[PDB]
Amino acid sequence: QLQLVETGGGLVKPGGSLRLSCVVSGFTFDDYRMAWVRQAPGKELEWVSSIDSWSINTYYEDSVKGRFTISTDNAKNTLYLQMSSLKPEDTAVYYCAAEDRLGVPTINAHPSKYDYNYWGQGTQVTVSS
Amino acid sequence: LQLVETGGGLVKPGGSLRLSCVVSGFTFDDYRMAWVRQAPGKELEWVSSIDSWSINTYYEDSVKGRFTISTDNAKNTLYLQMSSLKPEDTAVYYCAAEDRLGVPTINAHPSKYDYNYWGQGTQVTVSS
Amino acid sequence: RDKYANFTINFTMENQIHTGMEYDNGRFIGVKFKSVTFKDSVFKECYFEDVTSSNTFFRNCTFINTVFYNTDLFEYKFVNSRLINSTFLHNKEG
Amino acid sequence: ERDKYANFTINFTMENQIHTGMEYDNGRFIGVKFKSVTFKDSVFKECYFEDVTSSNTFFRNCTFINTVFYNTDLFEYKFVNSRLINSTFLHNKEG
Amino acid sequence: KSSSVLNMRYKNDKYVDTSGYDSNININGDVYKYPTNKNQFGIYNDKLSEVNISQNDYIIYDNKYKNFSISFWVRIPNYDNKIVNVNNEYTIINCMRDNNSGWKVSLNHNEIIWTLQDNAGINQKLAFNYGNANGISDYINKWIFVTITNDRLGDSKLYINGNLIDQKSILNLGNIHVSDNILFKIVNCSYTRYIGIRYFNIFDKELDETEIQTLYSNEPNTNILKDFWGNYLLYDKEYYLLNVLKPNNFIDRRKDSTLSINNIRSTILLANRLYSGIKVKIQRVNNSSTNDNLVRKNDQVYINFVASKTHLFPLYADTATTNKEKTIKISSSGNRFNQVVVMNSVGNNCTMNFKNNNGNNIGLLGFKADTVVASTWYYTHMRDHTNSNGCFWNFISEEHGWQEK
Amino acid sequence: IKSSSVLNMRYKNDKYVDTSGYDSNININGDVYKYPTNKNQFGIYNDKLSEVNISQNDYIIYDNKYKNFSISFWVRIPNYDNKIVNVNNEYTIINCMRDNNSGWKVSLNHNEIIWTLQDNAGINQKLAFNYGNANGISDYINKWIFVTITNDRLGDSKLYINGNLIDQKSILNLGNIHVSDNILFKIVNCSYTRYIGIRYFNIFDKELDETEIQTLYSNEPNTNILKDFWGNYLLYDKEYYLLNVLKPNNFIDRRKDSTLSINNIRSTILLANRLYSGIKVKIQRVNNSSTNDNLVRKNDQVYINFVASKTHLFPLYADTATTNKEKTIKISSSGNRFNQVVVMNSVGNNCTMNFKNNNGNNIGLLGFKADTVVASTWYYTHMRDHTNSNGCFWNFISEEHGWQEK
Ligand SMILES: *[C@@H]1O[C@H](CO)[C@@H](O[C@@H]2O[C@H](CO)[C@@H](O)[C@H](O)[C@H]2NC(C)=O)[C@H](O)[C@H]1NC(C)=O
Ligand SMILES: *[C@@H]1O[C@H](CO)[C@@H](O[C@@H]2O[C@H](CO)[C@@H](O)[C@H](O)[C@H]2NC(C)=O)[C@H](O)[C@H]1NC(C)=O
Ligand SMILES: CC(=O)N[C@H]1[C@H]([C@H](O)[C@H](O)CO)O[C@](O)(C(=O)O)C[C@@H]1O
Ligand SMILES: CC(=O)N[C@H]1[C@H]([C@H](O)[C@H](O)CO)O[C@](O)(C(=O)O)C[C@@H]1O
Ligand SMILES: *[C@@H]1O[C@H](CO)[C@@H](O)[C@H](O)[C@H]1NC(C)=O
Ligand SMILES: *[C@@H]1O[C@H](CO)[C@@H](O)[C@H](O)[C@H]1NC(C)=O
Ligand SMILES: *[C@@H]1O[C@H](CO)[C@@H](O)[C@H](O)[C@H]1NC(C)=O
Ligand SMILES: *[C@@H]1O[C@H](CO)[C@@H](O)[C@H](O)[C@H]1NC(C)=O
């Protein structure tokens, strides 16, 4: 029943705001650190943001900090990424990912598949005038 | 190569305690044994020493008569019988082992390197 | 008859017919078999891993204590062969 | 074509620096804390490191020859695409 | 002059008293001796198998007020958790006279019992029921440290593995006269079984928590690593792996040569399977014939994945990545990649430090997400972090004392 | 004495000559090694042509029945890995017997030195010394050993090792000995490839007494020059491992706080302790007057440098910033010597290092307390008669080919 499904990605004008939603099934957010990771057109994966929910802690890629805002809702078991002030280079496929909390809590900037327990399918986010 | 102390507690002026230090890894044949005190605020202060091979025990001027150092015939347990305890005695007490083959100096204010092995320490409190 | 032992093959084998061999503690890791045949051979305590095959067969062969891990060496590739204490693990089924 | 430096002793914090195409000969780094320092395309010949802590510090495409690292935290992940020839790590700052 | 009045130790093919009070120790029948540690002995009940200590008259307890303590380690297999499932108290250590005066160590289903009785028949019993394994058991088929202290003006205290778990007053007990003989013998067990005993000590004082914990820490050689059961860790022995932080998980191989940890253990009723996952073997780097098979602190070793009985592949840290943590990989080629492993321990938990031959640290064996990795993180988070125990491993040997089908 | 010397092999002017005055000829054939620091020491091998032949003068060739005579020399025998030499085979090193094997012979076996004396009739007599495998530290293996042999024709033949009598059989039954014209230093009939070191070969025409043998043992190597572990001359600008005489089973290691530990137990290959463990030091001249050579002498003022790597030396100094009487020895990472010097001195093969202030004040001999290498003045008044006296004595071990450990 383990699954992550992302929605909300689309095309918004530069300086816009989007709300990505990763609906997860099979696990609770108390047992797993959640993360948003972006993949550019042909470039290597780039970690965007992470959240520890058991204690509210958030982590943002230096560029992302202040603009985006990661959140969770054990309420509806849904992970959120509230985008805002979108810039052109934020155009990519945005996957949500779940990492076992009990493992080494490092945050690799350019992760591979083994950096997370579970990955999603990915929603496209294009930003062009 | 370990020392573990016990026997410390809380007492009144004039009481008595018996501190013991159990050793693992060596016997008292190759090491001189020592008690060293640390009272709050002051630096480490040597209390007593014993040579097992010989009948030579050493004390400091301030404790001679009230404190007695001892070893067993197994040569692996160190004792300090403390009597007529004064409030100035209140301190953490460590058992220590010096290599007998080294320079036989006894500094009153020793650092870590004055002895091969130090214990964990046991608290001795003299309270009214 | 011809005994080879304590060996490891990591390369492609193409268009070969090996007859009358006695492999002992052989290793076939990452091998791609293309039109290869083994006849009257003995595999003694051998090990296969990441082996893809095509037009490959083991005719009149005997396997003892051999492990096949992550292989496509399915049942039909063993013609008139004995498999003694030989195990297949995590086949390349899909 | 590397800028050479030799028989130098360094004993101070180094912050926010990129050193590219350098050749340190018989250099000493004693009691140095590295902070966001990157060595690129450099060669370390008969160099010495002692009591070194590092943060966000890397050695990318570097060569080390007859270099000793004593009491450092310069673990493996700090050496990217680098080759160590007869370079030894002794009494690391952990493990 | 020590507090130790009896210490049962091994020398030159028999057990002797090393205390100094010269009690005699005799073996009758078939008593098993552990090769790796001959201080440990096994007694059976399907044949003649006993150990008898003839106490020196000087140390035989016959007072009303003299404090005394007893210590030992016991190993109790269940075999299947079925044959042992019977409610019946059976003796393993007897120091009681004809009038049942003295003391007794007895067992029951997942239970250890201490009994102390005086000359008038007044007794007190302390017990510890560790029960059936719920996940991982810290007792079943493991070495358990038992300590009993007796203050004649207070309580009798029972410690397991250094922790006080039972106490009851013995103020109502008068003169206690123990037996002249201490008999190690499984008596009145309804099934066939064996029991392990080691490091039997009698002291003429009430041990405090510090002394008990010291015995617990130091009685097995701290320099030698332990296995899951609490025996010495051995070279060239097949072991399953257990991660202390992930007891309900086992390690499995992937087709890419990586090691996974996202495999849930099956249960037998409430008891995780131990004999699941990959097997490993520890190999000496620098081997002499003078060297034994014991794995010690700071030993440089190789960890080999066991593909089959006769096929071993070196496990290495795959450094060819941009990540700080490096995935552990099986080397199908046999190449060791100029790497070595340093062994160490904290208590019964083992650590494995992957290093380069040049002395460079790669990391302690742990996990990240679902993969076994080597990480330098652990170096600075060994104790007080939630994830600290991710670098602690147990080595599980498949043994007759723990069976699962 | 010298009145009794009828043959003395000494190095002079590019070769080996006889300084006795009886004019015996000495010839080198093939590849004979000459020790650079003491060219009186030479090494013969068996893998190529390598021998020394002494053609004795007609006057000194032994041809009597009643004339007492002595032979003296030093031999150095390496065991290498300690395995290759483990073979029961008596091989000869010094041959002074004619076609009919009349004369004398010095031969070697595994950890054994054998002396043989054979008469004209064919009657022989042998003495031997077996020093055995190293149990801890060996005083013989790969070291210079002083061999003396006295022969009283009306009594016993005695073999001395390092001035101490170890074997004496009688030679009364031997008649006339007509020794060879030649004394051949050559390794003959050895199972394995090896080399052997010889120095200070002397023949005397009397029975030397213990006093004369001890005079030779004491005076033959220069008493003014310090000795290393192997018994060679102690050198400047040479890397040495340390050995404490009182603690032979321990070696010195570096601590992160720049102190030196002595609580490290030496590993063992079989029984033998590892010699190539721990820190390395180098002795440096403080007054480099240039003209002076690399030999360390008594009362020399030196610096002791710790070797971090081949090209990275750091001063060792005494840390006088404490209230303790003894001062910890520390490594100076800055290169500061802290206004200190070291005075070298010696008792036999054992070396002393006195750390002193430049103002002339004593800081102390290099010793140990508890687990730390220190400088202490205590030794000054307890250098001979005390359980702990030998704590201030050190040996310098040079990593060489003749002692292999892996
Ligand atoms: C670093 O200093 C060393 C001395 O320790 C220099 O090596 C010397 O080089 C000069 C000139 O080439 C020679 O005359 C000396 O004999 C050398 N001394 C030794 C001990 O090797 C070295 O060259 C200096 N580094 C550079 C290249 O500037
Ligand atoms: C920096 O990178 C370049 C590119 O790999 C390296 O140059 C190669 O080095 C290897 C080993 O010396 C040689 O086989 C090739 O001939 C080199 N190729 C080129 C393009 O020159 C160089 O080694 C690296 N430098 C450092 C300091 O590590
Ligand atoms: C004390 C004890 O009873 N040891 C038993 C051992 C150990 O259980 C095993 O070797 C390692 O734990 O196994 C036996 O030899 C066996 O195979 O039947 C029985 C023996 O009695
Ligand atoms: C007497 C003698 O032959 N000495 C040898 C020396 C050492 O003096 C040796 O270790 C002594 O035991 O080493 C050599 O010079 C060398 O390896 O280059 C060969 C030389 O043959
Ligand atoms: C393979 O290796 C094993 C391990 O030593 C050896 O016993 C055997 O003889 C080898 N097989 C052959 C025939 O090469
Ligand atoms: C593949 O096999 C060959 C022959 O046994 C061997 O030389 C090579 O190292 C192996 N692996 C690699 C590195 O390709
Ligand atoms: C094969 O396995 C069986 C099953 O127990 C066993 O009896 C036998 O030892 C094995 N035979 C071979 C070929 O090794
Ligand atoms: C480097 O190491 C090699 C062997 O690994 C050794 O022979 C030599 O002393 C060292 N020097 C160089 C630069 O080769």
Coordinates of N, CA and C in Angstrom, one line a residue, chain D residues 9 26-28 30 46-48 50 66 68 70-71 90-94, chain F residues 253-258 306 308-314 331 333-335:
Chain D
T9 N 55.1 26.8 6.8 CA 54.2 26.3 7.9 C 53.0 27.2 8.0
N26 N 56.4 20.4 0.7 CA 56.9 20.3 2.1 C 56.1 21.4 2.9
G27 N 54.8 21.4 2.8 CA 53.9 22.3 3.5 C 53.4 21.7 4.8
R28 N 53.2 22.5 5.8 CA 52.7 22.1 7.1 C 51.4 22.8 7.4
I30 N 49.2 22.9 10.6 CA 49.2 22.5 12.0 C 48.2 23.4 12.8
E46 N 55.2 15.9 -0.1 CA 55.8 15.8 1.2 C 55.2 16.8 2.1
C47 N 53.9 16.9 2.2 CA 53.2 17.9 3.1 C 52.9 17.2 4.4
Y48 N 52.5 18.0 5.4 CA 52.2 17.5 6.7 C 51.0 18.2 7.2
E50 N 48.4 18.4 10.8 CA 48.3 18.0 12.2 C 47.2 18.9 12.8
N66 N 53.6 11.3 -0.6 CA 54.4 11.2 0.6 C 53.9 12.2 1.6
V68 N 51.5 13.1 5.1 CA 51.0 12.5 6.3 C 49.9 13.4 6.9
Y70 N 48.1 13.6 10.4 CA 48.0 13.2 11.8 C 47.0 14.0 12.5
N71 N 46.1 13.3 13.2 CA 45.1 14.0 14.0 C 44.2 14.9 13.2
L90 N 47.0 9.0 10.1 CA 47.3 8.5 11.4 C 46.5 9.2 12.5
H91 N 45.9 8.3 13.4 CA 45.2 8.8 14.6 C 44.1 9.9 14.2
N92 N 43.2 9.5 13.3 CA 42.1 10.4 12.9 C 41.3 11.0 14.0
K93 N 40.7 12.2 13.8 CA 40.0 12.9 14.8 C 38.7 12.2 15.2
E94 N 38.5 11.0 14.7 CA 37.5 10.1 15.2 C 37.6 8.8 14.6
Chain F
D253 N 55.4 6.1 21.9 CA 54.4 6.6 20.9 C 54.1 8.1 21.2
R254 N 53.6 8.8 20.2 CA 53.2 10.1 20.2 C 51.8 10.3 20.7
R255 N 51.5 11.3 21.5 CA 50.2 11.6 21.9 C 49.7 12.9 21.2
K256 N 48.4 13.1 21.1 CA 47.9 14.2 20.3 C 48.2 15.6 21.0
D257 N 48.4 15.5 22.3 CA 48.8 16.7 23.1 C 50.3 17.0 23.1
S258 N 51.0 16.2 22.2 CA 52.4 16.4 21.9 C 53.3 15.7 23.0
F306 N 62.0 14.8 16.8 CA 61.0 13.8 16.5 C 60.7 13.8 15.0
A308 N 58.1 13.3 12.2 CA 56.7 13.1 11.9 C 56.6 12.4 10.5
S309 N 57.4 12.9 9.6 CA 57.6 12.2 8.3 C 59.1 12.4 7.9
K310 N 59.5 11.8 6.8 CA 60.9 11.8 6.4 C 61.5 13.2 6.4
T311 N 60.7 14.2 6.0 CA 61.1 15.6 5.7 C 60.6 16.5 6.8
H312 N 59.9 16.0 7.8 CA 59.3 16.9 8.8 C 59.8 16.5 10.2
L313 N 60.8 17.2 10.6 CA 61.3 17.0 12.0 C 60.8 18.1 12.9
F314 N 60.6 17.8 14.2 CA 60.2 18.8 15.2 C 61.0 18.6 16.4
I331 N 56.6 17.5 21.9 CA 57.0 17.9 20.5 C 56.6 19.3 20.3
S333 N 55.6 21.8 17.5 CA 55.1 21.9 16.2 C 55.6 23.2 15.5
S334 N 55.9 24.2 16.3 CA 56.3 25.5 15.8 C 57.8 25.5 15.3
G335 N 58.6 24.5 15.8 CA 60.0 24.5 15.6 C 60.8 25.2 16.7

